[PDB]
Amino acid sequence: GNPIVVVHGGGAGPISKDRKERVHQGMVRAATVGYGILREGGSAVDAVEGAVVALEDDPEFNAGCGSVLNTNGEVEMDASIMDGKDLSAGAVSAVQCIANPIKLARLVMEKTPHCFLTDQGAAQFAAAMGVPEIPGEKLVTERNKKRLEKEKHETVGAVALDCKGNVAYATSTGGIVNKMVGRVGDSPCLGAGGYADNDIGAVSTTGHGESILKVNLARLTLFHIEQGKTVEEAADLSLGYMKSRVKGLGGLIVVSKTGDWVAKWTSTSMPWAAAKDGKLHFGIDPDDTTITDLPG
Amino acid sequence: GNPIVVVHGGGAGPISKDRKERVHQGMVRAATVGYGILREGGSAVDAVEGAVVALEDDPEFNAGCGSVLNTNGEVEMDASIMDGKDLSAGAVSAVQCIANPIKLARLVMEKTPHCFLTDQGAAQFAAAMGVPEIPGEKLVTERNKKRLEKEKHETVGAVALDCKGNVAYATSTGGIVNKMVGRVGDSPCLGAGGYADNDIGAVSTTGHGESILKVNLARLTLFHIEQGKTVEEAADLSLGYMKSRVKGLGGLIVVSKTGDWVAKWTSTSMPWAAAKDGKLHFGIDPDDTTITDLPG
Ligand code: NA
Ligand code: NA
Ligand code: NA
């Protein structure tokens, strides 16, 4: 009947008003892909993957090109993707030297009997699937070099509901700035970086991964919904619990199986967008929600 | 209040009756350690860690020495440990050439600001913490070589509640036989391989990791308990859902914050034990269960 996609570009401090425009374009671009896949009758899984591939490639976002740097100034990436129909799933942690982690995560889903590969095994699998190796400097940006140095001297996602009622999520990240080598956050961990179940809804998360893991943020959001809460309530309760119980900030996007959706966050901002019923909703701060009529 | 420990040695097919005896001793040994830590007023965390170190070292159990082999006939190990008071946690995935993964997981919890390290980063952190490297052939047993060849031609854990009312879990594994290089199962993933929260209880799981991850078995068990189910009901519902929804078999051990506990499984057997009120309970098949009066 009425497909939806929601996308997020990761929490942040306040954002430079020039930088906000480039971020807006990034988000819109990703929603346009996601929504276009759904409008032709494609699947929720291809919709979330396509949106996330766009944000990975866009260097304003901490995923793929533009990933934050680890303690050695290198890019190490996590991702996962999940289909709500049968709960099948794919994820990779600590991958290096590839453009699109979410696409390697989909290959784990489709081409192996496992849901999760890491580091060397993931690199081997990538090679065996013909994924091209790109040099790591390609993913490093100047903004992120300076962000590393500042921090020493002292994530993207999408969910969707498709024409057949299937839901799905995808989440991809470079991590947190100055993380230890081989540190793994919530983003590749089912129930933490996201969760997708046709009997409830789908969620993708962002923020302090350690906190997100300790509270199982994605799955916890969906529990509240199983208990009769609205998506707005579910998101406020889960993010509030993470704040009070473990002093962790972040955000998330959710879509229930009936088409209700929301974006919430406890950081200052989280770039988000949603496309539904021929309308594109967009925001960054809790002030500035725009609705744009699309054709349709 | 009065302390409990429960331990499990992983699901299995039916077990050779000679082998059952060695397994029995293994389990009793691990409960004895766990329970001896609690009885001197030690913590739930040190209790679950000590039980699991014993089962890692024992070659009858798929964790540490006696880990199942991956597709290249090598040992690759996952583990995690979690404290229910403040939800803090440590985990490692795809580690090689160390005797005790659960101790490396505890060091991630105590000595880093992260909850999860993998592969090369985990090996580096281990080296920097002085963990000795042991050669991989030390963890490989003859039974596991033959188990690998059979599959080609064709987990341990503990929970506890301590004198102060804190709970915890620990889970450690060598994986599933013939897994791809760098495959990661549920055991190092919070909410899947286990979960611990003083407001609810603690759970450690075993079985088909992919399924466990897709359902968030550990956290799911606890949800059912938050909804007013008994521990026995919670476990039956959560394992039944894994069976029906994704065709996955396994088991788990659970302890609520009020001291109720149980062991359940959907595989043929699961070696388990529990110590409480001066009694030691033990079993392998669902049919029979021994209770031994301890001196306490
Ligand atoms: Na990017
Ligand atoms: Na062992
Ligand atoms: Na497990």
Curated annotation (Swiss-Prot), chains A, B:
<protein>
    <recommendedName>
        <fullName>Isoaspartyl peptidase/L-asparaginase</fullName>
        <ecNumber>3.4.19.5</ecNumber>
        <ecNumber>3.5.1.1</ecNumber>
    </recommendedName>
</protein>
<dbReference type="GO" id="GO:0004067">
    <property type="term" value="F:asparaginase activity"/>
</dbReference>
<keyword id="KW-0378">Hydrolase</keyword>
<dbReference type="GO" id="GO:0006508">
    <property type="term" value="P:proteolysis"/>
</dbReference>
<dbReference type="InterPro" id="IPR029055">
    <property type="entry name" value="Ntn_hydrolases_N"/>
</dbReference>
<comment type="subunit">
    <text>Heterodimer of an alpha and beta chain produced by autocleavage. This heterodimer may then dimerize in turn, giving rise to a heterotetramer.</text>
</comment>
<dbReference type="InterPro" id="IPR033844">
    <property type="entry name" value="ASRGL1_meta"/>
</dbReference>
<dbReference type="GO" id="GO:0001917">
    <property type="term" value="C:photoreceptor inner segment"/>
</dbReference>
<keyword id="KW-0963">Cytoplasm</keyword>
<dbReference type="Pfam" id="PF01112">
    <property type="entry name" value="Asparaginase_2"/>
</dbReference>
<feature type="binding site">
    <location>
        <begin position="206"/>
        <end position="209"/>
    </location>
    <ligand>
        <name>substrate</name>
    </ligand>
</feature>
<dbReference type="GO" id="GO:0005829">
    <property type="term" value="C:cytosol"/>
</dbReference>
<comment type="similarity">
    <text>Belongs to the Ntn-hydrolase family.</text>
</comment>
<keyword id="KW-0007">Acetylation</keyword>
<feature type="binding site">
    <location>
        <begin position="183"/>
        <end position="186"/>
    </location>
    <ligand>
        <name>substrate</name>
    </ligand>
</feature>
<dbReference type="GO" id="GO:0005634">
    <property type="term" value="C:nucleus"/>
</dbReference>
<keyword id="KW-0645">Protease</keyword>
<dbReference type="GO" id="GO:0033345">
    <property type="term" value="P:asparagine catabolic process via L-aspartate"/>
</dbReference>
<comment type="function">
    <text>Has both L-asparaginase and beta-aspartyl peptidase activity. May be involved in the production of L-aspartate, which can act as an excitatory neurotransmitter in some brain regions. Is highly active with L-Asp beta-methyl ester. Besides, has catalytic activity toward beta-aspartyl dipeptides and their methyl esters, including beta-L-Asp-L-Phe, beta-L-Asp-L-Phe methyl ester (aspartame), beta-L-Asp-L-Ala, beta-L-Asp-L-Leu and beta-L-Asp-L-Lys. Does not have aspartylglucosaminidase activity and is inactive toward GlcNAc-L-Asn. Likewise, has no activity toward glutamine.</text>
</comment>
<dbReference type="GO" id="GO:0005737">
    <property type="term" value="C:cytoplasm"/>
</dbReference>
<feature type="active site" description="Nucleophile">
    <location>
        <position position="155"/>
    </location>
</feature>
<dbReference type="InterPro" id="IPR000246">
    <property type="entry name" value="Peptidase_T2"/>
</dbReference>
<dbReference type="GO" id="GO:0008798">
    <property type="term" value="F:beta-aspartyl-peptidase activity"/>
</dbReference>
<keyword id="KW-0068">Autocatalytic cleavage</keyword>
